């Protein structure tokens, strides 16, 4: 169903829900999953669609981290719990994208689009992902 | 007129106005033109007057980005209307500098100087490129 890249990200997203002991996996954790670590090879974060688009990867991260703090940290029994309805929607939307794109396995990139569409970092100090034109152009230019 | 080095910067500035879908070119886009890409020979950014003037050019880039995100609109059809009276003044100032220097063409050195005369950071302890006197101290190491 999912590519090795998407699986890496979702493994990490679910992992993060348990690492930060959150009540549920949220779009924030997937964004955080994309920000695995500032690895030079980090396609979804250092080399991503936002940094080469409109906003600084370092600041984007700090917002996401603030959101990881804002999502309550709970005991191991209430911790993690679920993938969440929110992502049931994001990932199903990523699947729709796969069909649009003629790709048999879910790309982490498709997750980035579905994910980004739900999220919105509406700070006056906006870090909200650059919209779809910059995101898509940069996605199309990946590797190749 | 302008030579290729100045034209590159000027071209980039106008491009940047369109990269931000803004109706007009502003001093901020030119400052952004000064800091495009990490190519050392670019006096406007790396082997610059800024480092020699004891300033952090990446911090300055953060300042520029902080200002770029404050551009009031990114509307597509409204984009690319004018170079702006503000920069009319700057480019006219560059011409004044050419007269001051007996120079048959505007180099990036001149276009830098002209904007710097009209540039600012709305900051007391500006992290801006070093002020004009230093700009001259180091700019005058170029050509002759």
Contact A126 B62 (CB under 8 A): no
- Burial (CB count <10 Å: 0-12, 13-18, 19+), residue B64: buried
Could you count the other beta carbons within 10 Å of the beta carbon of residue B69? 17
Contact A59, A67 (CB under 8 A): no
User: Resolution of this entry in Å?
Assistant: 9.3
Q: How far apart are CA A31 and CA B1, in angstroms?
A: 48
For residue B2, what are the β-bridge partners? Answer: B106
The CA–CA distances, whole Å, from B14 to A51, B9, B131 equal 20, 9, 25
Residues of A in contact with B65 (CB under 8 A): 56
- Burial (CB count <10 Å: 0-12, 13-18, 19+), residue B29: buried
Candidates A42, A83, A64, A81; CA nearest to A129 is A64
Candidates B11, B8, B10, B4; CA nearest to B114 is B10
Residue A16 sits at φ, ψ, to 5 deg, of -60, -40
Q: Quickly tell me which residue has 């011409």 as its tokens.
A: B95
Closest residue, chain A, to B61 (C-alpha): A56
Interface test with chain B among A51, A52, A54, A127, by most B beta carbons within 10 Å: A54
For residue A130, what are the β-bridge partners? Answer: none
Contact B34, B2 (CB under 8 A): no
Contact A34, A44 (CB under 8 A): yes
Residues of B in contact with A137 (CB under 8 A): none
Residues of A in contact with B62 (CB under 8 A): 56
For residue A57, give how far its alpha carbon lies from the nearest alpha carbon of chain B (Å).
Answer: 12
Interface test with chain B among A50, A59, A63, A123, by most B beta carbons within 10 Å: A59
Contact A71, A78 (CB under 8 A): no
The CA–CA distances, whole Å, from B39 to A4, B36, B42, B45, B50 equal 35, 9, 6, 8, 15
Q: Which residues contact A64 (CB under 8 A, 6 or more apart)?
A: A28, A31, A32, A35
Residues of B in contact with A54 (CB under 8 A): 69
Q: Which residues contact B87 (CB under 8 A, 6 or more apart)?
A: B13, B25, B26, B27, B30
**Which residues of B lie inside 8 Å of A (Cβ-Cβ)?**
62, 65-66, 69
Contact B57, B51 (CB under 8 A): yes
Closest residue, chain A, to B20 (C-alpha): A54
Could you count the other beta carbons within 10 Å of the beta carbon of residue B140? 11
Give the rounded distance of the alpha carbon of B12 from its chain centre. 10
Candidates A23, A44, A59; CA nearest to A111 is A44
Q: How far apart are CA B129 and CA B118, in angstroms?
A: 12
For residue A52, give how far its alpha carbon lies from the nearest alpha carbon of chain B (Å).
Answer: 11
DSSP state of B106: B
Q: How was this structure determined?
A: cryo-EM
For residue A76, give how far its alpha carbon lies from the nearest alpha carbon of chain B (Å).
Answer: 40
Contact A53, A44 (CB under 8 A): no
For residue B97, give how far its alpha carbon lies from the nearest alpha carbon of chain A (Å).
Answer: 34
Interface test with chain A among B69, B70, B72, B76, by most A beta carbons within 10 Å: B69
How many inter-chain contacts (A to B, CB under 8 Å) are there?
7
Residues of A in contact with B69 (CB under 8 A): 54-55, 125-126
């Amino acid at each position: 169903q999912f590519t090795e890249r998407a699986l890496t990200i979702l493994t990490l997203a679910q992992k993060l829900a348990s690492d930060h002991q959150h009540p549920q996996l949220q779009p924030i954790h997937i964004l955080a999953a994309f920000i695995e670590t500032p690895e030079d090879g980090s396609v979804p974060y250092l080399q991503n669609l936002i940094e080469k688009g409109r906003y600084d990867y370092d600041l984007f991260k700090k917002v996401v981290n603030r959101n990881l703090v804002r999502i309550p940290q709970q005991q191991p029994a209430p911790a993690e719990i679920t993938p969440s309805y929110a992502l049931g929607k994001v990932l199903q939307d990523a699947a729709k994208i796969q069909k649009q794109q003629k790709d048999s396995f879910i790309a982490q990139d498709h997750i980035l689009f579905a994910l980004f569409n739900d999220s919105s970092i509406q700070q006056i100090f906006k870090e909200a992902q650059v919209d779809i034109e910059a995101i898509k152009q940069q996605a199309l230019e990946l590797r190749g």
